Structures are given as structure tokens and as C-alpha cells.
Design a protein around this ligand. Structure first.
Ligand SMILES: Nc1ncnc2c1ncn2[C@@H]1O[C@H](COP(=O)(O)OP(=O)(O)NP(=O)(O)O)[C@@H](O)[C@H]1O
Lengths: 571, 576
């Protein structure tokens, strides 16, 4: 059962540690019920005449129990932290070296909160599972089990009566858990519908303040939710009160008293044996309903342990194939897609047998409708994912047989997602060559039209860029374009949407790109097909494969899909 | 200071609930005090004399049943009303909270306060309020009934309520102060890994990924981990109440066992008091059990106080007397800032927009233009301002006249979950289906709905809805054109690829016959040849204004922008 599962493979080194922890936390919770066993021996000593010296030997035992139950708990709470700090430290060093090996496109399939939700929240849920949820789930089971065994050896006749309020409660609770078959998934669909509603209501605040009647939808979806909750709960109240009156200690006390009065008064009980039940038996319903509450604390720890183990299991980029043959014709810049096929999900292909061929020192544009597969086809060259069926090769060598440093020392890309690193503004312009004399860092920032904007910084080039720096997306982009100018990769992957993603700084980005895309092999993800009309080879494609191919002057002659995207208004 | 308080429907149906939850505790105290004559009789030589005291215990148990049943049936209806009255307060407060409050964290907080407070507001009075306030008064009422019986053990039990409650408050303060250091150290550890994953493409593409991994790795490997400080944090919060409760029992049972040896009590009734001392200590343990249930509730319902104590904007009386004509918008020494560390700054802006004129606002990115529009709309208040429209300061108007003056086309278009024709009718829900006929033939969305499967009644909230970002900015133009306020504030969308959304705003300006006073923050070039005066704004200050015949012949800050915008449109990626 507990095998070969995600949470079972992650939390594998903590087997003997957690076993010792459970053994030690069983004694800790057994040394807290032992005082009530000493109370029954103190009572017997009062009943049986003598004392005043034998009654100190019970107080000695009680203070010894206090001391040894404090020592045991203090030892457990530090074992459970020494043994958890080591696991967390060794698990962070695994996440750090898994991120460095995952395919790069993975990081785009996620967001920025989906990474924190796994690196911080899922590593804190494990810390809490180890330090709280496991020692609590052991006590929550050992306490009622020990009480029930101690009360049956004392007297089995009165310990049977304590099952009345348990059968009465379990009958009801099931009669109630099937009256909410629908409404326990209805209320889960409502809880995720009312979250998107809150998100939209918060995101559309400005509109709601200009047009007042735009919040009517939210305010009527909310009266439906807080009306559903009432119509769901208001029925099942005379059941939740009934099953609550059956676990109250005032209910167990009456049963114990009525059953003990019958046995003592008829001379078959020896009333010193009814005292264990008066001490430990009245709070016996709380323990049985705390069992489930203690076992339900492991769920939010095991979910985290599974979410971490699926990520640590994610298939990472292939190691590299045999450093095979450069296929006899391709110059160091020539790029060849050869029958590539690729799809994100294992049954839905997004690319079908595309076989284009770039050339050394030429431009090549990728036109097509939206969601056509041109962004995917572009980022397939940077090995954001691996191709399923075909094979790409830049320079004559399959990009699968290239080291991660030799690939990016030969293929560069300027997409969206600026991604400045934390550090000096000259530490970003010279990231791909960290020892640039700072004269090249200047001649390269004067070409990306970002030199006068960085001289207007507090320290100038030595300014430490951060989350808030005072740089718009169009001048954070001329930095990564300056960096890319120092890289000098002879093959560029240009996303043409980076030009017009910031309209103010849109003529300076175009002067930076005029310099970045010189004397090299460019591949443009075109969006506006009037910029790419002097490209050497334009390539059309519709939801997958390639349909038409050629220059613009010719491609305009043989009418279809290109004349149909061209004459569509603009012309 | 609203936190989670009760409704405003009644006051005699809320004070007779405390007098019921308090009698439900008197019943349990009487049920426990009735154990003294019963157990004192069971341990005597005539144990059949304990039937009289089981009769009275039955009488005291069947009464506690009724009192606990009514107190729960009422506590459920009081949870229903708390849910109803609280969810209608957050939703009534949010449209008045100041817009700069909605940061990235406050938006998450406020969306949790709406989406994730449902079931723990109904299950509050019956799950946390009565079980907690009953278990706190129970030992104090038990101690009071003992004074006629044994005053020594009664006084020793009054003395123990403050100590045992202090040991419960202190062991929770310790357990809470350590759990914050625990998730602060974890964050201080895993924020270099969060950065290493954020800037990943930049590293691998720069061939700098393995040295950065080495850096984060060695720092992580050492970090000293600061653990045993948190051990010292954690231990007292685990041991304090357990030690206190185990120590109170020893004292109370050695007091009872001593009053015997001397002769105060006899043994039978010294045991009846040891049985009562144990029952007196169970409420304290029950309070210790719903400590996590109280901390989770406190956290979850702190998000509601976060909203109900958020700063609200204040509006005057106003009554926009004669809005009719067309308003002459005027800024006067206006200066604005969300705060002063970083953000769109503005200071010294002062113009006067003649009534019934189209006015463009161009400039560097520096979006103190999306702020100049918000200051006119009323969405933001100036810090040294008096924005005044048609002569009268905006901040001196009640916020149903302060919004009945400006129609706005935002930058990022927002549509709520609903049909296409109810997003447009959100502007004027009483439009006479000809105002709807030409709010859509102006916005160029008549074709968009006469080319759509069911067209008009398409649900367009968020499903993808077949509507792209550029044609979702043609329904905002149709909404804004419907509402007939005498000010139109357009904030052009960065969206290219349009080929229709351009002519949309062009026709909105040049075609509409409603005769309002229009103000556009333009990025395109065709929507600037319709304005009759331009405002070039740099560094939060109008550097020049005028028509495009004197700006162009001024050869200054705007002729350069003109030239650049003309050259940034005939750009083409080339090999050469
Ligand atoms: N991370 C992803 N996981 C699964 N499917 C994806 C992912 N990213 C994109 N797709 C789908 O892959 C298909 C190709 O999309 P894409 O590669 O963006 O083509 P595109 O035309 O270049 N993008 P665009 O031009 O902006 O519409 C579409 O059906 C997308 O929805």
C-alpha cells in the first residue's frame, strides 16, 4: 500500500527517524495519562486506612512523572528538529540542481507564483508535517487507545457502556454524510467559482468606479453563494446538535454515574474501581473525535510531498547524443530543421514535418495566424523542448549532441521576458562576457541606445538594478539587447513583438535591433508582415505544418494565404 | 474598528443568547457539584443512599441537554447572520477603498477575504465562540460552588483560574512567536532559489548558469541554519501548559489528602472532592485543544479586518449643478504621487482645456499620463491640486456626481463574466436599444456581433470567448460611448495588429455627435491629427502645448517625436 508512490519515495530517508519519533512520542503521551493512574492509587491509600508517609511516596512519584515527561518531550521536540533541518537542507540542494537541469521551456509553462508555491510553501508544509503533524497524529491515536485498554482491565462492564455514545454518534454521522453527497462537491465548485469572481471584482475596480452598474453581476453571484450556504447548512442542524450532545462529557458522566451506582449499591463493584472512569472516562468522546482531527493533519503535508516528488521526477533535457558528423555542406551558421514534429501534450502535435533551412547571413520570417506554432517552432531551436520525431542541427551538428554551453555559444535569442539579473547595470550588459573592460560595456550600450538612459541613473553604470529601478519594459529591453550584442552568437532568434511592446520606446528599440541583427543569421517571429517584406525567405504556416514558402515578391504572385493575409486591409 | 462583528437586526435576541449560553454553563457546574454527595455516599457504609443523588444528577443532565441544544440552534442562526452581514460589508467597502491600496499583496488579501471566508463564518459562533467562552467560565463557576462545601479547596481553586489561564495564554504566545520565526527563516533560505529560477533563461543563454549555481549552492550549504535558537523558541510553547496542569493537580490533590489526615474532611468526601478537582481541570485542557482552531480562525478573519480598516477616499456634497453645457477642465499646480520612493511622479502641471475640444497627451513612457487621466476622472486625488471641472473643484462633490461627469476608455479593457450586451449596458442600463444601436455602429462591433455564433448574447467574461485583446477593446469603446457624460477620456491600447481598433477610436473622436469634451492619451499617429491641441508631458510637467502647426514649426520636443513616429512605421528587418 505505502509503496512506489510520490510521497512515499520522497519521505524515504525519514523512516527510522520517524519510527524513533513515534516511539518517543508514545511515551510522552503515556506519561501524561499516568498521573490519573497515580490518583487512583492515592485514593486507594486513603480508603485503606493508613498514610501520611505512604502518601508522600505518591507525591514523589508524581513529581518524578512531571520531570520525566518534561524531559522526554524536550528531547522529542529537538530530535524532530535536528532530523528535519538536515532533510530540508538536503532537499533544497536537490531542488537547486533540478532547476539547473530542467528543460528551459518548462519555466515558461509555469508562472512566477507557481515556482514559489513549490519552493517555499511546499518546503514549509514538509517542515510542519515533520515537526507538528507527525508527533500530533501519534498522540491523537495513542491516548484513546491507551485509555480504552486501561479502562477494560479495570472493569469491562462499565467500559462497554462507553460505546453507547459512540454507536449513537457514528449512526448519525453517516446518516448525515449521506445527505450531502451532492452538496459537498457543489460547495467545492462554488468555492472555486467565487474565487474567480473575487479576482475579477478586484481587477476591475477602476471600471466599477466609473460605471457604477458594473458590479451588479458580482453582487448577485455573492447573494447566490451566501444563499446556497444557508440552504445547505440550515437543514442539517438538528443532526449536528444531536451528534454533538452525544459526545459531551456531561453525557458520559451521567452514564458512568448511573452504571456505577447500580454496580456499587448492589455490592458488585468495589467503588475504588469506579474512579478510573470518573477520572479518564468522561473526556473519552473528545479523544475519539480528535483521532480524526489529528489524522487529517497529514493531508496537507503529503500533498506537498507529492508535488515535490513529481517535480523532482520531471524528465529533464537529454544528456547529449554521440558527437556525430557535421553533414558535409553546412557552414558554421547554417540551420536545418529536418522533418521536425513536436507537440506539448503527448497526443496533440503542434508541428508536423517542418523542413525549412536557414542560410548563413540571411533573414527568415515566420508568418501565420494566431496560435499557429511559429513561436513554438522558434523556441524549438533554442532547445526549450526536444523534438519528438525530427532533428534540428545548427552548423551541421544536431543540437541534441551539443553541450549547453556550446549551444548557446552558437544560438542566441531575443524574446519577450526581459529578465534582468540582480546586480550592477554593467553586470547585465556584460553577462555573457563578465570580464569586458567596461569600454566594451559602453560601446555596446551606446549601440543599444541605452547609454544616456543609464548615465541618468544614481551611480550610473554601477547602479544596482532591482525589482523597482525606474526602467520601463522598453528600456529593460534595450539592456538585454545590449547584453546580446556582446554575446555575438552568429544565429539570432528575434521575436518581432519585442519592438512594439512599449510604444514610447519603440523607435530606439528598432535602432538597437538594427545593430543586433547585422552580419548574422536571423529568424523572426513576425507579427506585422509589413516589416518582413525584404526578408530573404518568408514562411507561412497554419496550426502546424508549413503551407507556402518563398520571398515576398514571388510569394505574392502565386496567390493564397499570403495574398490573403496581405490584402486583408493593409495591402 | 470593524473586525468580525454581529448584524444590526436586533439587540434583545443577542442579549438573551448570552443569558442562555451562561445557563448552559450553570447546568454543567451543578452537574459536577452534585457528584460530591453522590460519590461521598458510594464510598460510605450505606451506598444505597446514592439513588437520591443520581435522581438529581439526571435532572441536571436532562436540563443541560435542552440548554445545549437551544444554544446551538441559536448559534447556527447567528452564524448565518454574521456571514450575511460580513460578506455584504466587504463588498460595500471595496468600491470606496483608495485605488493605490490595491497593491500586489493587498489584492491577494482582499480576494481571500471574499472567496475563502464562507464556511468559517457560519461555523464561528457554534464552533469557536461558545465552546471557548463556556470552557473559560466553567472552572470559575465550579470553584464558586465549592466555597459552601470546602472553603479551603474553593479558595485554592479560585486562585488557580488566573494561573491556569495565564499558562494557556503564554504557551500560545510562545507557540505563535516561534512559528513566525520558522517561516521567516525558511523564506530567508528559499529566496535565492526563487531568484535562480526566475532569471534562468538569462543565465543559460549567457553560459553563466553553473557558477551561479555554485554561488547559491555554497551559500545555501552553509547559512549556519540558525536552528537551536528556534529550538529554544519551540520548547516552552510545548511544555508550559502541560507542566502547569500536571502541577495544579498535584497541589489540589495534596491539599485534599492533607485536609483528611488532620480531620477536616472524612475519607469518603475527600474522594468526592478529588473527583471534582479532576472535573475542574478538564475545561482548561479543552481550551488548550482549540488553540489551533483559534489561530487558524484568527488568521483567516484578519483578512477581513485588513479590508474593513483599509483607507477610504472621502467625497463632499457637490450636487453637480449645471453639468449640462460642457465642462472646461483645468489643472492648477497639481502634484501627485502614490507615495515617494518610486512611481509616476507629477508636479507643476497646470493647464485649461477649453470646453468641447479634443486634446491629445503625448510624451515619454513616464506614465504620468495614465495618471493625468485618473486625476480628471476622479479615481485619484491630487496632493497639491484642485483639479476643477467647469469651474468647480472635483473633491467637493459627492461620489455619485463625481462619477456622473466622465466616461472612460481604459488601457487594459475589463469585461465581467456575462453577455456582450450586458457589458455594454453596464454604462447605462436604461439605454433605449437605439443608444445601443449606435454605440456599437460607432465602436465597430456591429460586425463583430454579426459575425459571431450567437453574437450579441455571447458570454464574454473569461473563457477565451474567441475575442482577442484588440476586439475586447471595441466593447469598452461601446460601453463608454453609451453612458452619456460630457467628458470622454480615452487611454489608447498598446495593442497593434488591430486594423480596426484604430479606426474605432478615430471614429469615436471624429464621428460621435454627443458633443462632449474629449481627452486622449495617444500612442498612434492618426489619432493625433484629430486633436486640436497637444500636451507634451515630460518628467511630470507639461513642457509644451499647442496645435500641430506651431509645435511642428517650433522644431523642438514635439517635432522630434513626430519625426520618430514617422520613421518607426516604415521600419523593416533587413539582411544587408
Ligand atoms: N506551454 C504550453 N503548453 C501547452 N500548449 C501550449 C503551450 N504554449 C502554447 N501552447 C499551444 O501550442 C499551440 C501553438 O502556439 P504558439 O506556439 O504560441 O503559436 P504562435 O502562433 O507562435 N503564438 P501566437 O502567434 O501569439 O498565437 C497553441 O495551440 C497554443 O495554445
Amino acid at each position: 500500500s505505502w509503496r512506489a508512490q510520490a510521497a512515499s519515495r520522497l519521505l524515504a530517508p525519514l523512516k527510522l527517524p520517524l519510527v524513533l519519533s513515534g516511539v518517543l512520542a508514545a511515551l510522552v503521551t503515556l506519561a501524561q495519562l499516568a498521573p490519573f493512574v497515580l490518583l487512583v492509587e492515592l485514593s486507594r491509600l486513603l480508603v485503606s486506612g493508613a498514610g501520611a508517609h505512604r502518601l508522600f511516596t505518591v507525591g514523589f512519584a508524581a513529581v518524578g512523572l512531571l520531570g520525566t515527561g518534561a524531559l522526554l518531550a524536550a528531547a522529542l521536540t529537538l530530535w524532530l528538529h535536528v532530523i528535519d533541518a538536515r532533510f530540508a537542507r538536503a532537499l533544497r540542494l536537490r531542488l537547486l540542481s533540478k532547476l539547473s537541469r530542467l528543460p528551459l521551456g518548462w519555466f515558461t509553462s509555469r508562472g512566477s507564483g507557481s515556482i514559489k508555491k513549490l519552493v517555499t510553501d511546499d518546503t514549509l508544509a514538509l517542515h510542519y508535517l515533520v515537526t507538528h503533524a507527525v508527533p500530533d497524529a501519534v498522540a491523537a491515536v495513542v491516548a484513546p487507545v491507551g485509555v480504552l485498554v486501561y479502562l477494560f482491565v479495570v472493569d469491562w462492564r462499565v467500559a462497554l457502556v462507553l460505546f453507547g455514545p459512540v454507536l449513537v454518534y457514528l449512526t448519525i454521522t453517516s446518516s448525515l454524510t449521506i445527505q450531502s453527497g451532492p452538496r459537498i462537491v457543489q460547495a467545492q465548485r462554488w468555492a472555486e467559482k467565487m474565487n474567480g469572481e473575487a479576482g475579477s471584482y478586484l481587477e476591475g475596480q477602476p471600471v466599477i468606479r466609473v460605471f457604477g452598474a458594473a458590479s451588479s453581476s458580482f453582487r448577485r453571484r455573492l447573494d447566490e453563494y451566501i444563499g446556497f450556504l444557508v440552504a445547505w447548512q440550515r437543514p442539517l442542524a438538528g443532526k449536528k446538535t444531536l451528534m454533538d450532545l452525544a459526545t459531551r462529557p456531561a453525557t458520559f458522566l451521567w452514564l458512568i454515574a448511573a452504571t456505577g451506582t447500580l454496580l456499587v449499591a448492589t455490592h458488585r463493584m468495589d467503588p475504588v474501581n469506579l474512579l478510573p472512569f470518573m477520572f479518564l472516562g468522561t473526556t473519552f468522546g473528545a479523544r475519539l473525535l480528535g483521532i480524526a482531527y489529528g489524522l487529517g493533519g497529514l493531508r496537507t503535508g503529503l500533498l506537498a510531498a507529492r508535488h515535490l516528488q513529481v517535480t523532482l521526477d520531471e524528465t529533464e533535457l537529454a544528456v547529449r547524443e554521440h558527437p556525430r558528423e557535421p553533414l558535409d555542406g553546412e557552414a558554421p551558421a547554417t540551420v536545418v530543421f529536418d522533418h521536425v514534429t513536436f507537440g506539448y501534450r503527448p497526443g496533440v502535435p503542434v508541428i508536423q514535418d517542418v523542413s525549412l533551412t536557414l542560410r548563413p547571413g540571411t533573414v527568415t520570417a515566420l508568418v501565420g495566424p494566431s496560435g499557429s506554432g511559429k513561436s513554438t517552432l522558434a523556441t524549438l531551436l533554442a532547445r526549450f523542448h526536444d523534438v519528438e520525431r525530427g532533428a534540428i542541427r545548427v552548423g551541421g551538428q544536431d543540437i541534441r549532441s551539443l553541450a549547453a554551453d556550446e549551444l548557446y555559444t552558437r544560438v542566441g535569442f531575443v524574446l519577450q521576458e526581459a529578465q534582468l539579473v540582480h546586480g550592477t547595470a554593467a553586470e547585465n550588459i556584460a553577462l555573457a562576457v563578465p570580464d569586458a573592460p567596461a569600454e566594451q560595456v559602453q560601446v555596446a550600450a551606446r549601440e543599444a541606445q541605452i547609454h544616456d538612459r543609464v548615465l541618468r541613473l544614481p551611480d550610473g553604470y554601477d547602479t544596482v538594478l532591482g525589482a523597482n529601478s525606474g526602467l520601463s519594459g522598453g528600456e529593460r529591453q534595450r539592456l538585454t539587447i545590449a547584453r546580446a550584442i556582446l554575446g555575438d552568437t552568429p544565429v539570432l532568434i528575434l521575436d518581432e513583438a519585442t519592438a512594439f511592446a512599449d510604444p514610447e520606446s519603440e523607435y530606439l528599440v528598432q535602432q538597437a535591433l538594427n545593430r543586433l541583427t547585422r552580419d548574422r543569421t536571423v529568424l523572426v517571429i513576425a507579427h506585422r508582415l509589413h516589416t518582413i517584406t525584404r526578408a530573404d525567405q518568408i514562411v507561412v504556416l497554419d496550426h502546424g505544418r508549413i503551407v507556402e514558402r518563398g520571398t515576398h515578391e514571388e510569394l505574392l504572385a502565386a496567390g493564397g494565404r499570403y495574398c490573403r493575409l496581405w490584402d486583408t486591409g493593409q495591402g | 474598528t470593524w473586525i468580525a462583528l454581529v448584524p444590526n437586526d436586533h439587540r434583545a435576541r443577542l442579549i438573551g443568547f448570552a443569558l442562555l449560553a451562561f445557563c448552559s454553563v450553570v447546568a454543567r457546574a451543578v452537574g459536577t457539584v452534585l457528584l460530591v454527595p453522590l460519590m461521598a455516599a458510594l464510598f460510605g457504609e450505606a451506598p444505597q443512599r446514592a439513588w437520591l443523588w443520581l435522581g438529581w444528577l439526571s435532572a441536571a443532565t436532562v436540563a443541560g441537554w435542552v440548554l445545549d441544544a437551544v444554544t446551538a440552534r441559536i448559534g447556527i442562526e447567528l452564524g448565518f447572520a454574521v456571514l450575511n452581514h460580513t460578506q455584504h460589508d466587504v463588498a460595500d467597502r471595496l468600491p470606496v477603498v483608495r485605488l493605490d491600496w490595491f497593491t500586489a499583496e493587498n489584492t491577494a488579501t482582499a480576494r481571500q477575504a471574499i472567496a475563502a471566508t464562507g464556511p468559517e463564518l457560519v461555523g464561528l459562533v457554534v464552533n469557536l465562540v461558545t465552546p471557548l467562552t463556556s470552557a473559560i467560565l466553567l472552572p470559575a463557576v465550579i470553584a464558586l460552588a465549592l466555597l459552601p462545601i470546602s472553603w479551603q479547596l474553593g479558595v485554592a481553586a479560585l486562585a488557580g483560574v488566573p494561573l491556569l489561564l495565564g499558562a494557556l495564554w503564554a504557551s500560545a504566545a510562545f507557540a505563535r512567536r516561534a512559528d513566525t520565526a520558522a517561516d521567516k527563516a525558511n523564506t530567508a533560505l528559499t529566496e535565492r532559489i526563487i531568484e535562480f529560477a526566475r532569471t534562468q533563461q538569462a543565465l543559460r543563454a549567457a553560459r553563466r548558469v553553473e557558477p551561479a549555481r555554485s554561488l547559491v549552492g555554497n551559500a545555501l550549504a552553509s547559512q549556519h541554519t540558525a536552528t537551536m535558537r528556534l529550538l529554544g523558541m519551540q520548547i516552552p510553547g510545548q511544555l508550559l501548559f502541560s507542566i502547569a496542569s500536571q502541577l495544579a493537580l498535584i497541589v489540589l490533590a495534596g491539599t485534599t489528602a492533607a485536609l483528611t489526615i488532620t480531620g477536616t474532611l472524612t475519607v469518603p468526601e475527600a474522594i468526592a472532592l478529588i473527583v471534582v478537582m479532576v472535573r475542574y481541570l478538564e475545561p482548561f485542557t479543552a481550551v488548550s485543544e482549540l488553540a489551533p482552531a483559534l489561530e487558524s480562525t484568527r488568521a483567516t478573519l484578519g483578512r477581513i479586518g485588513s479590508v474593513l480598516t483599509a483607507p477610504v477616499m472621502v467625497a463632499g456634497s457637490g450636487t453637480w449643478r449645471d453639468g449640462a453645457v460642457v465642462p472646461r477642465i483645468e489643472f492648477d499646480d497639481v502634484a501627485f504621487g502614490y507615495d515617494g520612493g518610486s512611481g509616476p511622479v507629477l508636479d507643476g502641471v497646470s493647464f485649461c482645456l477649453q470646453p468641447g475640444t479634443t486634446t491629445a497627451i503625448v510624451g515619454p513612457s513616464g506614465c504620468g499620463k495614465s495618471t493625468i487621466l485618473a486625476l480628471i476622472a476622479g479615481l485619484h486625488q491630487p496632493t497639491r491640486g484642485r483639479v476643477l471641472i467647469d469651474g468647480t473643484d472635483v473633491a467637493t462633490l459627492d461620489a455619485r456626481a463625481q462619477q456622473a461627469v466622465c466616461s472612460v476608455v481604459f488601457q487594459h479593457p475589463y469585461l465581467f463574466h456575462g453577455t456582450i450586451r450586458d457589458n455594454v449596458f453596464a454604462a447605462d442600463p436604461g439605454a433605449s436599444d437605439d443608444q445601443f444601436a449606435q454605440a456599437v455602429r460607432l465602436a465597430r462591433v456591429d460586425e463583430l456581433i454579426a459575425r459571431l455564433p450567437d453574437g450579441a448574447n455571447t458570454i464574454v467574461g473569461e473563457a477565451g470567448s474567441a475575442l482577442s485583446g484588440g476586439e475586447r477593446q471595441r466593447v469598452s469603446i461601446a460601453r463608454a460611448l453609451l453612458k452619456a457624460a460630457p467628458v470622454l477620456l480615452v487611454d489608447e491600447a498598446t495593442s497593434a495588429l488591430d486594423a480596426e481598433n484604430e479606426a474605432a477610436v478615430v471614429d469615436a473622436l471624429a464621428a460621435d455627435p454627443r458633443s462632449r469634451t474629449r481627452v486622449i492619451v495617444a500612442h498612434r499617429l492618426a489619432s493625433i491629427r484629430h486633436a486640436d491641441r497637444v500636451l507634451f508631458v515630460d518628467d511630470g510637467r507639461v513642457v509644451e502645448d499647442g496645435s500641430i502647426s506651431e509645435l511642428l514649426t517650433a522644431g523642438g520636443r514635439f517635432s522630434q517625436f513626430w519625426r520618430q513616429q514617422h520613421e518607426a512605421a516604415e521600419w523593416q528587418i533587413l539582411a544587408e
